[PDB]
Amino acid sequence: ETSYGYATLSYADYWAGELGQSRDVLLADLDAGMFDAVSRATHGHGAFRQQFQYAVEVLGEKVLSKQETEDSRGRKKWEYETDPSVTKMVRASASFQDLGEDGEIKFEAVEGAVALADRASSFMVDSEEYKITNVKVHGMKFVPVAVPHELKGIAKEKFHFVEDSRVTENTNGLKTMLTEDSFSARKVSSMESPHDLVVDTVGTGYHSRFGSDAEASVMLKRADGSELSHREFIDYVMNFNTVRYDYYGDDASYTNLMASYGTKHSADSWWKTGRVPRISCGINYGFDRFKGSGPGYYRLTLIANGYRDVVADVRFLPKYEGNIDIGLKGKVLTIGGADAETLMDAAVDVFADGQPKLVSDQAVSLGQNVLSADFTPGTEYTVEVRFKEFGSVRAKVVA
């Protein structure tokens, strides 16, 4: 017959079926390759977040002495003296239980691995402490799967398969085991649940991390429209798995799909344990797993256990290529060097270093623009021009 439960799949094993490729084809400071494990030299805060849903390994150096310091902001940090010659590599894994009333994440340890503490910078093994220096994430611990009776054994030993009465033939995201080493594309279910989330808004203006060509900030709310409580948001990210990127190029009607790309958490997507219900998705057009991507229209599909898929449509504007002249004199702002078309519905913000905006949400057009504010001669202002069809540009201008 057929058994249902959860299995642990690497990023390549998960995406092979989704992209109609093979695991081998998907294996090949920044992570610009395909779906090989996401390695990173880090502190361990990302390791803490990922130990719940992902197969994580952390490397650390033996601590000889440490001291907790507080800086001028009131933030506390542990400084360690270590022996780099003595290292330990362990699995970091925890089983999320709930968000306590005090806002703390409650969890249980997992046999065979250490359970990192929130904001972890070290871990312990045989009563020795190790400062975290590297983190490696291989894939997802909990992928809902259907396993043919004859593959059950191989599933258990090779993909840590564990039958679970919560997974059935109608589970959203269910992937079927096809051979001893491959799984099918996931099957989507339209089954609705009270806790389902939908997009509140999606932004492209927040750039939380360096290294992406574009970033989408997906703000979430409950399907019935209610805003999410901290606990509801946490229950969601504690079940979040991955995101699919569908690219429609310059097709604003989302009719002609050009390509689909898989992603790897941390490198391409991230979330925090705080109170803002946001999931960030970034893309770098130069990574191998995004070969062929560029500015344009995207459809992002967030995939989480027990929740309906969350689909978000976004547009990443191309960069405006040269030729824009800005002048400031008296109350007049003059713009030249670009087509009158390029500047249609254009707008600007103007502000002098470190000061509140002198000019904000000011619609403008090619030529002279008589404003309300006076630009004090000698003062150097920053002028940010927002275009309708291009990424915004900012230049320094002296009135």
Ligand X SMILES: O=S(=O)(O)O[C@@H]1[C@@H](OS(=O)(=O)O)[C@H](O)[C@@H](CO[C@H]2O[C@H](CO)[C@@H](O)[C@H](OS(=O)(=O)O)[C@H]2OS(=O)(=O)O)O[C@@H]1O
d(CA 397, CA 175): 57
Question: Going residue by residue from 21 to 40, which x/- string records binding to a copy of itself, judged by CB under 8 A?
Answer: --------x-----------
Q: Which two tokens stand for residue 127?
A: 């009563």
Binder of residue 59, out of ligand XE, a copy of itself, ligand X, none (CB less than 5 to 8 A by kind) = ligand XE
The binding track of 234-273 with respect to ligand X, each residue x by CB under 6 A or -, is --------------------------------------x-
121 binds a copy of itself (CB under 8 A): yes
Q: How far is the CB of 89 from ligand XE (least distance, A)?
A: 5
Strands 214-222 and 197-203: antiparallel
CB of 269 to ligand XE, least distance (A): 8
**According to the binding rule CB under 6 A, does residue 286 interact with ligand X?**
no
Q: How far is the CB of 130 from a copy of itself (least distance, A)?
A: 12
Residue at 361: amino acid letter: D
Does 227 sit near ligand X (CB under 6 A)?
no
CB of 46 to ligand X, least distance (A): 12
CB nearer to ligand XE: give 312 or 328.
312
Q: Which of 345, 331, 205 is nearest to 278 (CA)?
A: 205
Residue 200 vs 246, nearer CB to ligand X: 200
H or E segment and range at residue 186: strand 182-187
Neighbours of 128 (CB within 10 A): 12
Q: Is 26 helix (H, G, I), strand (E, B) or coil?
A: helix
Which among 47-55, 218-226, 261-269, 296-304 is the span making contact with a copy of itself, rule CB under 8 A?
218-226
CB of 342 to ligand X, least distance (A): 30
**In the sheet where 259-261 sits, what is the strand order?**
259-261, 240-247, 296-304, 310-316
Residue 344: strand, helix, or coil? coil
Hey, what are 157's tokens? 């030993």
Could you tell which of a copy of itself, ligand XE, ligand X, none binds residue 306, using a CB distance below 5 to 8 A set by kind?
none
Distance CA 9, CA 26 (A): 13
Residue from 274, 286, 330, 337 binding ligand X (CB under 6 A): 274
Are 82 and 61 in contact by the 8 Å Cβ rule? The answer is yes
The first and second tokens of residue 217, run together, are: 């900030």
CB-nearer residue toward ligand XE: 58 or 197: 58
261, amino acid identity: Y
Query: Is the sign of the CA dihedral 19, 23, 24, 30 positive or negative?
Result: positive
* Contacts with ligand XE, residue ranges (CB under 6 A): 39, 57-59, 66, 68, 78, 89, 134-136, 214, 216, 245, 281-283, 298
Question: In whole angstroms, how close is the CB of 123 to a copy of itself at the nearest point?
Answer: 15
Residues at the interface with ligand X (CB under 6 A): 272, 274-276
